Amino acid sequence: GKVKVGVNGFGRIGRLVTRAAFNSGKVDIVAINDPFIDLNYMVYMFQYDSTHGKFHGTVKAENGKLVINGNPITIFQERDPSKIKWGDAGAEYVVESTGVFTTMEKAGAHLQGGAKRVIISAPSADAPMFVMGVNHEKYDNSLKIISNASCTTNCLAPLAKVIHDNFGIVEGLMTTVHAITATQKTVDGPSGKLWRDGRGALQNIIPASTGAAKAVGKVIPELNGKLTGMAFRVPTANVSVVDLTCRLEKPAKYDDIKKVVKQASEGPLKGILGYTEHQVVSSDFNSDTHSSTFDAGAGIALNDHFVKLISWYDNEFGYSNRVVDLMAHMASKE
Amino acid sequence: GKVKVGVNGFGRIGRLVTRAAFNSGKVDIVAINDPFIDLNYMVYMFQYDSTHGKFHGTVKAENGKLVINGNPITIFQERDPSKIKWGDAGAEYVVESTGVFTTMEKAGAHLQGGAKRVIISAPSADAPMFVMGVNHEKYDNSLKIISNASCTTNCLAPLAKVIHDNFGIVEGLMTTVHAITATQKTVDGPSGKLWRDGRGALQNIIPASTGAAKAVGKVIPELNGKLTGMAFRVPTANVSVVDLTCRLEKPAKYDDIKKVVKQASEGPLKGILGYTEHQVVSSDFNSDTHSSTFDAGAGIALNDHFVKLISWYDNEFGYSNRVVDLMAHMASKE
Amino acid sequence: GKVKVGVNGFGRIGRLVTRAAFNSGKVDIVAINDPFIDLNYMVYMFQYDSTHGKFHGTVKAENGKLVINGNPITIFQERDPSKIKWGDAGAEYVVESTGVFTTMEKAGAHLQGGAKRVIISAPSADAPMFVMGVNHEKYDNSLKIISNASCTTNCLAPLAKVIHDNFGIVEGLMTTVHAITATQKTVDGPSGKLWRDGRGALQNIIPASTGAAKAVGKVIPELNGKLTGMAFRVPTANVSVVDLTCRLEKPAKYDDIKKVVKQASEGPLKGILGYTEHQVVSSDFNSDTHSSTFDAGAGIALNDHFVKLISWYDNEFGYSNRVVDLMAHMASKE
Amino acid sequence: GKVKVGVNGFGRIGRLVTRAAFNSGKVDIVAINDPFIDLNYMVYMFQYDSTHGKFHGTVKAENGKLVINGNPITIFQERDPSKIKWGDAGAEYVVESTGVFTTMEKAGAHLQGGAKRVIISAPSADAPMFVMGVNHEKYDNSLKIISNASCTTNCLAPLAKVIHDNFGIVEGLMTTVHAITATQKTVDGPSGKLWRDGRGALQNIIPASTGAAKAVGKVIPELNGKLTGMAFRVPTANVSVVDLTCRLEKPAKYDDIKKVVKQASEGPLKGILGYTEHQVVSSDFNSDTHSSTFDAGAGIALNDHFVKLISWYDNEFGYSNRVVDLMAHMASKE
């Protein structure tokens, strides 16, 4: 009884969500909407990927439909989201991934198209936010349109939840060394809003401001007003690492932190929070489905009330898998 | 008696043309037009450069004008090129560098604005093409709108002229390993027209097609229909190298080729064609004003009628200096 | 009846040969010799790879032996190759991959250790050279020590053989845009022999001289003295492309060249020479086992007697697979 | 009355120290010792630089001596430091920059060669440590052999001194995003001691451990046992940024921190500690002689007792200038 899923927008997040859905098999993709991309271009884009390699399967175009592993997918090219006939294709859930419809009113334009529930793959100002393994038990069948927050937030939230539940975080500051994204540009370029983001991505570091640590307090209400930070954008393909410096109420040696993190990674947070002790680097976490992997050897502790923790997280993947897992849990709650 | 120069578009070519004009002092910039960039953003963009470093001088904004080294520059923000009041600012020549007005009819929209002559910093379908040091003596004061072809063409043309004048090129194929440009994109991305150009610039090589070697036959009429080739786009900041494989009529040892190239580089083509024998790499030619520099040690010769020549050329700079030199020669012919 | 294979040196070529042998299953690895690497370091090096990703299997160390997929491997740490007890481990063939024993006299030091035949994974001055699919039928059971030439040579030889057999290459010049290797260095550095190779690999192009096209005439005797060229070293992880500019005796349109290349790629040279018509880039050929893949859209033809051909080849892989295939053919001839 | 300076080792630090000494003109270089580099190779290495560009001056070799700007320099090629005739060349101070003679006993081998005082351009276990602008007034003419600590330490120490003097740092954790160095290697490689450092520098982030924040407590005795941290090695040419997260005794808004940092940067710490408010990136600090530049817009403050500060520092340069400034102050104290 897999739910029917339509995808709005065939960008990096939409293609990776489709790839993760076909690899895991938890949900079924029946419809893809993109107005600027024709069918053969979507075949070429889904077939070849520079970062994650070639697709393991058969993808082609026939009868005006995108056939992936023998499964036909109806293609729409409507710019206005209110005109898309989601109910004609039979799609029950709709993943909004264009990044321009983030408010509840804008994302509610899929409702008159025949869609039941809309999941936004972006942070939202007013839609409820859910992170798998942290607060996903708060979801109700009354929540038609929700949000999966952001990848960084998805990296920070389970580790922060475990550390706050075991030792009581007083306050913390987070720094995330981030890989390059589609919004950056080569050889400098223009960028009215953010002047730093318009510089050349290949030759620079480029500090930036983010609100993921502030969104952690939205996801976990006890940590509201205790977490904030910034980011660096280094020229890496698809690996980012989160660094969290925090102060704790109860004394905690580094071995106790490692023990409780490994214990949480084994049972309750299996598949979400990872644990390792090897001498790993960034490219060892390519195409990893974990939301975050705790690095035991990388972190350092100044004292029992002042520590610093390091976590690896894949930007492209992982989140897509959390979107698929959230849709599966939503279908299970139906 | 320096000529007054206005610049349309403040992109990479326009900023570098302004920088080269202020460094050399041959011409004077009195007007800059760009509709999407405000004045403080142009101050920030001209002040800081990721590739060529900080500007050697004083740049600021005062009284709604851009003051560079004590020289005020009037700023226009007109999208339609026919509405720009070039004659009000006193600009005599206009450098069209936006890359969207390449035909004679489109570039003639600056004529009713009060401009006398328009120089296009791009290849053109119907405007006459001039390369400094090769065919710039063919220019007439009757030529209001002309073109400076392309940088690659500007790299290939003097070396090909010298080799054809000394040994009689029968036919040749050219390959140019090119640095990244503003049209490429990080982390793959979309590109309807050219599907290869939409892939990730950081992780790929990306073969491409170019018409610079075909434009050499337009500049040099005796070589028409004898030169064609392609290109590779490697992730380099701003250095490209041209490789030319050719067949000659008269026998020519490699020492004779080196001798005639050094002799041509010394006298007639001083400052345009360079010559070196050191063990150089690409970053040794950063901020070099030469159109092309012949690498003696890099090339190889199969036999006296079949050789391969290597030339280094800076993409960002050099061309801008050739635009400034062409404008100076145009003002001298007046 | 798989042959027993020992590997001398656990560098990039030795590890990739072991990986290809365990993936294909044609031969069996029973012994690895390296004096500078301890056992746990070899476990860590074989387990994690930055370019080709994690190993698909189980690798561990037990009883002083390297266990890969349940197969134990004896480990030697002898610096002098004459003291290695190859016959004690039961290894019949020995792959010499350290790159310092390339002559016949130096590579013959494995013979008194109990090894029967020695295969050098490097170009050799006096050992016979064999390329799979080109001249591998010339091998005799009298040839104990031979060579597999080089990867570039392995890329160039089948395409050149097909083009020479169909159209009669008169002469040709080859340029190969190469990825970075272990001999290069970051942030410049020292390099007495080659001054260009000591410069910084990340920021430069670095022309270099190679003898692969000269070695093609050693492999194919009819093309002796007709092929020579050079190379460029761009900062790419593991993808290189070969560009060959050639003159032909019989007239040949580009469609006929594409037809004969596709026909040769289908039947006789299946798995060695590849053919494609898609808009591919370098990272599309990551972990590809083909020796060379002909790019139909990338090449250009000046005329029926003057053409330019483009081929993609993986530096790390492919060659390792050709070493494994050559050892399998050698065992079949026994 | 400039002091005579000899340099041991012509690596990256020695060449940059010579370049900074010839650019500033505070000291005079009379002798260079390197056993593995011949004279023409040093001419080529000093003439061309991939990061900082070509040398602004004349460098050549004549009469077995290195002539820079008309100044001859005697060249030694002695491996054993005790055999170098420093007193024959007239050198009074000796800069030890090979990185293998860091103890007092090993660096004292230059004393019987005729040298008076030895300055180590590396952290030392037992030699006294001096940072310019922080504790350089503690130096005595009784200190023949001393140390200039490390560049990171030189970046962190003035900012930490200002913040501790104004607001009383309780404890702090430091993270520094570092550019690539000569010890890293391309395409992975071997690294017995540190397994993470042997991975490929181009494709990875590579966490590492450093003792610069622990050395700050050695330089500033009041901060002993209050500062520790780690590092990340991203593939950048020559720009690194320091991030310091700290807790303060007295309340401090971000505007007060900016005011006291700007006031300290203007008067007492002119030329050592920099201040900026522009939207800068890493490549804007290329060839900057400041030890550290405070970034006002990049940092963030959680509350009045918990802040995070960002500072930019050039790895190659700056330190070399601090070595030259320390030698000038040492000569002034004589």
Side-chain angles (χ1 to χ4, degrees), chain A residues 1-82 84-95 97-115 117-125 127-143 146-179 181-192 194-332 334, chain B residues 1-82 84-95 97-115 117-125 127-143 146-179 181-192 194-332 334, chain C residues 1-82 84-95 97-115 117-125 127-143 146-179 181-192 194-332 334, chain D residues 1-82 84-95 97-115 117-125 127-143 146-179 181-192 194-332 334:
Chain A
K2 304 156 183 219
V3 70
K4 317 277 219 236
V5 177
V7 177
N8 187 52
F10 194 64
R12 198 70 177 97
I13 299 175
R15 288 199 302 277
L16 285 172
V17 153
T18 312
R19 199 154 173 166
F22 271 109
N23 281 352
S24 74
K26 313 211 190 178
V27 302
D28 292 342
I29 312 289
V30 301
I32 296 170
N33 170 76
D34 205 305
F36 301 94
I37 321 292
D38 60 85
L39 188 47
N40 298 310
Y41 201 25
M42 310 178 4
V43 169
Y44 171 73
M45 267 164 133
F46 193 78
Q47 168 108 72
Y48 295 103
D49 200 277
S50 290
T51 298
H52 312 288
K54 211 182 310 303
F55 176 66
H56 272 334
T58 68
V59 45
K60 50 186 257 294
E62 101 186 352
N63 303 113
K65 286 190 167 2
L66 174 60
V67 181
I68 296 178
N69 288 343
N71 305 102
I73 293 165
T74 313
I75 312 301
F76 295 119
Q77 287 221 2
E78 299 275 352
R79 177 179 299 90
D80 194 10
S82 49
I84 308 168
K85 310 305 289 321
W86 291 115
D88 292 7
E92 193 155 82
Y93 294 162
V94 160
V95 175
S97 69
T98 59
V100 300
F101 314 107
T102 51
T103 72
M104 297 216 43
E105 183 239 341
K106 263 164 199 215
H110 297 286
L111 293 178
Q112 44 286 69
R117 303 181 194 279
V118 178
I119 299 104
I120 307 168
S121 64
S124 176
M129 256 184 217
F130 292 96
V131 172
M132 278 297 306
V134 175
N135 68 325
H136 75 288
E137 307 279 354
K138 307 305 163 303
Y139 173 83
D140 302 344
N141 290 2
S142 60
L143 311 179
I146 60 179
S147 174
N148 192 18
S150 65
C151 64
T152 305
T153 299
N154 270 269
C155 167
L156 186 54
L159 176 71
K161 161 200 173 93
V162 165
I163 295 299
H164 180 64
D165 284 354
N166 275 266
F167 307 113
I169 295 171
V170 173
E171 65 201 336
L173 278 151
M174 179 228 74
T175 295
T176 173
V177 176
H178 204 47
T181 61
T183 55
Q184 295 191 245
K185 45 188 61 59
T186 68
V187 294
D188 295 292
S191 185
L194 300 324
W195 285 5
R196 290 201 217 228
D197 277 348
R199 308 292 298 271
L202 166 66
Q203 321 150 91
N204 298 296
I205 298 190
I206 311 180
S209 75
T210 173
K214 179 180 180 180
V216 168
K218 197 167 314 319
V219 156
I220 305 175
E222 309 95 287
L223 285 182
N224 195 277
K226 297 174 163 35
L227 299 173
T228 189
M230 32 84 54
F232 287 110
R233 288 167 195 283
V234 303
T236 300
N238 186 32
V239 189
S240 300
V241 51
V242 166
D243 156 27
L244 169 70
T245 296
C246 54
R247 182 149 69 96
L248 319 172
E249 301 157 1
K250 335 166 186 177
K253 302 172 155 41
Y254 202 69
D255 270 30
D256 304 352
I257 297 171
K258 283 161 61 183
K259 175 196 301 311
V260 299
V261 159
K262 182 207 244 265
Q263 167 178 133
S265 62
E266 251 150 21
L269 289 180
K270 186 177 183 59
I272 308 301
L273 174 73
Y275 180 81
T276 186
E277 270 170 23
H278 297 163
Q279 321 233 54
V280 292
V281 288
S282 76
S283 68
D284 292 331
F285 297 99
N286 210 62
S287 298
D288 203 297
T289 54
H290 283 97
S291 283
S292 46
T293 305
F294 181 77
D295 205 335
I300 199 156
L302 179 64
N303 51 64
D304 295 309
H305 303 267
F306 207 42
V307 299
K308 170 194 277 303
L309 315 173
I310 305 293
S311 193
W312 284 102
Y313 71 104
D314 182 9
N315 317 348
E316 290 300 2
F317 263 87
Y319 189 87
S320 304
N321 279 267
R322 286 311 97 74
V323 163
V324 171
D325 289 347
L326 180 62
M327 262 178 319
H329 179 256
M330 275 183 45
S332 95
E334 283 276 359
Chain B
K2 304 156 183 219
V3 70
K4 317 277 219 236
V5 177
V7 177
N8 187 52
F10 194 64
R12 198 70 177 97
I13 299 175
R15 288 199 302 277
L16 285 172
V17 153
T18 312
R19 199 154 173 166
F22 271 109
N23 281 352
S24 74
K26 313 211 190 178
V27 302
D28 292 342
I29 312 289
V30 301
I32 296 170
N33 170 76
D34 205 305
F36 301 94
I37 321 292
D38 60 85
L39 188 47
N40 298 310
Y41 201 25
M42 310 178 4
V43 169
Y44 171 73
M45 267 164 133
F46 193 78
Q47 168 108 72
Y48 295 103
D49 200 277
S50 289
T51 298
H52 312 288
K54 211 182 310 303
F55 176 66
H56 272 333
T58 68
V59 45
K60 50 186 257 294
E62 101 187 352
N63 303 113
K65 286 190 167 2
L66 174 60
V67 181
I68 296 178
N69 288 343
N71 305 102
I73 293 165
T74 313
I75 312 301
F76 295 119
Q77 287 221 2
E78 299 275 352
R79 177 179 299 90
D80 194 10
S82 49
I84 308 168
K85 310 305 289 321
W86 291 115
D88 292 7
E92 193 156 82
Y93 294 162
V94 160
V95 175
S97 69
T98 59
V100 300
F101 314 107
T102 51
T103 72
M104 297 216 43
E105 183 239 341
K106 263 164 199 215
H110 297 286
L111 293 178
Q112 44 286 69
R117 303 181 194 279
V118 178
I119 299 104
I120 306 168
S121 64
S124 176
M129 256 184 217
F130 292 96
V131 172
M132 278 297 306
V134 175
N135 68 325
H136 75 288
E137 307 278 354
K138 307 305 163 303
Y139 173 83
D140 302 344
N141 290 2
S142 60
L143 311 179
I146 60 179
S147 174
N148 192 18
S150 65
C151 64
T152 305
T153 299
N154 270 269
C155 167
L156 186 54
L159 176 71
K161 161 200 173 93
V162 165
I163 295 299
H164 180 64
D165 283 354
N166 275 266
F167 307 113
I169 295 171
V170 173
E171 65 201 336
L173 278 151
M174 179 228 74
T175 295
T176 173
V177 175
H178 204 47
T181 61
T183 55
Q184 295 191 245
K185 45 188 61 59
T186 68
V187 294
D188 295 292
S191 185
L194 300 324
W195 285 5
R196 290 201 217 228
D197 277 348
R199 308 292 298 271
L202 166 66
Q203 321 150 91
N204 298 296
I205 298 190
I206 311 180
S209 75
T210 173
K214 179 180 180 180
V216 168
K218 197 167 314 319
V219 156
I220 305 175
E222 309 95 287
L223 285 182
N224 195 277
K226 297 174 163 35
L227 299 173
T228 189
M230 32 84 54
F232 287 110
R233 288 167 195 283
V234 303
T236 300
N238 186 32
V239 189
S240 300
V241 51
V242 166
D243 156 27
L244 169 70
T245 296
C246 54
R247 182 149 69 96
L248 319 172
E249 301 157 1
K250 335 166 186 177
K253 302 172 155 41
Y254 202 69
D255 270 30
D256 304 352
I257 297 171
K258 283 161 61 183
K259 175 196 301 311
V260 299
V261 159
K262 182 207 244 265
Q263 167 178 133
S265 62
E266 251 150 21
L269 289 180
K270 186 177 183 59
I272 308 301
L273 174 73
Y275 180 82
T276 186
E277 270 170 23
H278 297 163
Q279 321 233 54
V280 292
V281 288
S282 76
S283 68
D284 292 330
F285 297 99
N286 210 62
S287 298
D288 203 297
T289 54
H290 283 97
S291 283
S292 46
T293 305
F294 181 77
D295 205 335
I300 199 156
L302 179 64
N303 51 64
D304 295 309
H305 303 267
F306 207 42
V307 299
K308 170 194 277 303
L309 315 173
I310 305 293
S311 193
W312 284 102
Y313 71 104
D314 182 9
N315 317 348
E316 290 300 2
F317 263 87
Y319 189 87
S320 304
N321 279 267
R322 286 311 97 74
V323 163
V324 171
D325 289 347
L326 180 62
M327 262 178 319
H329 179 256
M330 275 183 44
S332 95
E334 283 276 359
Chain C
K2 304 156 183 219
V3 70
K4 317 277 219 236
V5 177
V7 177
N8 187 52
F10 194 64
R12 198 70 177 97
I13 299 175
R15 288 199 302 277
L16 285 172
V17 153
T18 312
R19 199 154 173 166
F22 271 108
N23 281 352
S24 74
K26 313 211 190 178
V27 302
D28 292 342
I29 312 289
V30 301
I32 296 170
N33 170 76
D34 205 305
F36 301 94
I37 321 292
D38 60 85
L39 188 47
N40 298 310
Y41 201 25
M42 310 178 4
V43 169
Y44 171 73
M45 267 164 133
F46 193 78
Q47 168 108 72
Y48 295 103
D49 200 277
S50 290
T51 298
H52 312 288
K54 211 182 310 303
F55 176 66
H56 272 334
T58 68
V59 45
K60 49 186 257 294
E62 101 187 352
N63 303 113
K65 286 190 167 2
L66 174 60
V67 181
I68 296 178
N69 288 343
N71 305 102
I73 293 165
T74 313
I75 312 301
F76 295 119
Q77 287 221 2
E78 299 275 352
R79 177 179 299 90
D80 194 10
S82 49
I84 308 168
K85 310 305 289 321
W86 291 115
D88 292 7
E92 193 155 82
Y93 294 162
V94 160
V95 175
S97 69
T98 59
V100 300
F101 314 107
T102 51
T103 72
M104 297 216 43
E105 183 239 341
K106 263 164 200 215
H110 297 286
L111 293 178
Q112 44 286 69
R117 303 181 194 279
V118 178
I119 299 104
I120 307 168
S121 64
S124 176
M129 256 184 217
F130 292 96
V131 172
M132 278 297 306
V134 175
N135 68 325
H136 75 288
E137 307 279 354
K138 307 305 163 303
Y139 173 83
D140 302 344
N141 290 2
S142 60
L143 311 179
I146 60 179
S147 174
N148 192 18
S150 65
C151 64
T152 305
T153 299
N154 270 269
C155 167
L156 186 54
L159 176 71
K161 161 200 173 93
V162 165
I163 295 299
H164 180 64
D165 283 354
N166 275 266
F167 307 113
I169 295 171
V170 173
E171 65 201 336
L173 278 151
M174 179 228 74
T175 295
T176 173
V177 176
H178 204 47
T181 61
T183 55
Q184 295 191 245
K185 45 188 61 59
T186 68
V187 294
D188 295 292
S191 185
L194 300 324
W195 285 5
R196 290 201 217 228
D197 277 348
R199 308 292 298 271
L202 166 66
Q203 321 150 91
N204 298 296
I205 298 190
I206 311 180
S209 75
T210 173
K214 179 180 180 180
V216 168
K218 197 167 314 319
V219 156
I220 305 175
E222 309 95 287
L223 285 182
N224 195 277
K226 297 174 163 35
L227 299 173
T228 189
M230 32 84 54
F232 287 110
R233 288 167 195 283
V234 303
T236 300
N238 186 32
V239 189
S240 300
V241 51
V242 166
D243 156 27
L244 169 70
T245 296
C246 54
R247 182 149 69 96
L248 319 172
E249 301 157 1
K250 336 166 186 177
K253 302 172 155 41
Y254 202 69
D255 270 30
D256 304 352
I257 297 171
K258 283 161 61 183
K259 175 196 301 311
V260 299
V261 159
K262 182 207 244 265
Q263 167 178 133
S265 62
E266 251 150 21
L269 289 180
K270 186 177 183 59
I272 308 301
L273 174 73
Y275 180 82
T276 186
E277 270 170 23
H278 297 163
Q279 321 233 54
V280 292
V281 288
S282 76
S283 68
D284 292 331
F285 297 99
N286 210 62
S287 298
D288 203 297
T289 53
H290 283 97
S291 283
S292 46
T293 305
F294 181 77
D295 205 335
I300 199 156
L302 179 64
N303 51 64
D304 295 309
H305 303 268
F306 207 42
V307 299
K308 170 194 277 303
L309 315 173
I310 305 293
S311 193
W312 284 102
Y313 71 104
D314 182 9
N315 317 348
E316 290 300 2
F317 263 87
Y319 189 87
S320 304
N321 279 266
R322 286 311 97 74
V323 163
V324 171
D325 289 347
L326 180 62
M327 262 177 319
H329 179 256
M330 275 183 45
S332 95
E334 283 276 359
Chain D
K2 304 156 183 219
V3 70
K4 317 277 219 236
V5 177
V7 177
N8 187 52
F10 194 64
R12 198 70 177 97
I13 299 175
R15 288 199 302 277
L16 285 172
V17 153
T18 312
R19 199 154 173 166
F22 271 109
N23 281 352
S24 74
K26 313 211 190 178
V27 302
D28 292 342
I29 312 289
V30 301
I32 296 170
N33 170 76
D34 205 305
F36 301 94
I37 321 292
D38 60 85
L39 188 47
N40 298 310
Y41 201 25
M42 310 178 4
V43 169
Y44 171 73
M45 267 164 133
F46 193 78
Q47 168 108 72
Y48 295 103
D49 200 277
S50 289
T51 298
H52 312 288
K54 211 182 310 303
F55 176 66
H56 272 334
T58 68
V59 45
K60 50 186 257 294
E62 101 186 352
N63 303 113
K65 286 190 167 2
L66 174 60
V67 181
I68 296 178
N69 288 343
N71 305 102
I73 293 165
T74 313
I75 312 301
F76 295 119
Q77 287 221 2
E78 299 275 352
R79 177 179 299 90
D80 194 10
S82 49
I84 308 168
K85 310 305 289 321
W86 291 115
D88 292 7
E92 193 155 82
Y93 294 162
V94 160
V95 175
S97 69
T98 59
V100 300
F101 314 107
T102 51
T103 72
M104 297 216 43
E105 183 239 342
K106 263 164 200 215
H110 297 286
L111 293 178
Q112 44 286 69
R117 303 181 194 279
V118 178
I119 299 104
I120 306 168
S121 64
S124 176
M129 256 184 217
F130 292 96
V131 172
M132 278 297 305
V134 175
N135 68 325
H136 75 288
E137 307 279 354
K138 307 305 163 303
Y139 173 83
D140 302 344
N141 290 2
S142 60
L143 311 179
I146 60 179
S147 174
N148 192 18
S150 65
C151 64
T152 305
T153 299
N154 270 269
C155 167
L156 186 54
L159 176 71
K161 161 200 173 93
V162 165
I163 295 299
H164 180 64
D165 284 354
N166 275 266
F167 307 113
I169 295 171
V170 173
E171 65 201 336
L173 278 151
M174 179 228 74
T175 295
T176 173
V177 176
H178 204 47
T181 61
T183 55
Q184 295 191 245
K185 45 188 61 59
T186 68
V187 294
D188 295 292
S191 185
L194 300 324
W195 285 5
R196 290 201 217 228
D197 277 348
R199 308 292 298 271
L202 166 66
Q203 321 150 91
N204 298 296
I205 298 190
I206 311 180
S209 75
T210 173
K214 179 180 180 180
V216 168
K218 197 167 314 319
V219 156
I220 305 175
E222 309 95 287
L223 285 182
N224 195 277
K226 297 174 163 35
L227 299 173
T228 189
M230 32 84 54
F232 287 110
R233 288 167 195 283
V234 303
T236 300
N238 186 32
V239 189
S240 300
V241 51
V242 166
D243 156 27
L244 169 70
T245 296
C246 54
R247 182 149 69 96
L248 319 172
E249 301 157 1
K250 335 166 186 177
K253 302 172 155 41
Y254 202 69
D255 270 30
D256 304 352
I257 297 171
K258 283 161 61 183
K259 175 196 301 312
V260 299
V261 159
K262 182 207 244 265
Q263 167 178 133
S265 62
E266 252 150 21
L269 289 180
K270 186 177 183 59
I272 308 301
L273 174 73
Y275 180 82
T276 186
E277 270 170 23
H278 297 163
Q279 321 233 54
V280 292
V281 288
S282 76
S283 68
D284 292 330
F285 297 99
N286 210 62
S287 298
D288 203 297
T289 54
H290 283 97
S291 283
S292 46
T293 305
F294 181 77
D295 205 335
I300 199 156
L302 179 64
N303 51 64
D304 295 309
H305 303 268
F306 207 42
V307 299
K308 170 194 277 303
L309 315 173
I310 305 293
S311 193
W312 284 102
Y313 71 104
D314 182 9
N315 317 348
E316 290 300 2
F317 263 87
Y319 189 87
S320 304
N321 279 267
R322 286 311 97 74
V323 163
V324 171
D325 289 347
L326 180 62
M327 262 178 319
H329 179 256
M330 275 183 45
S332 95
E334 283 276 359

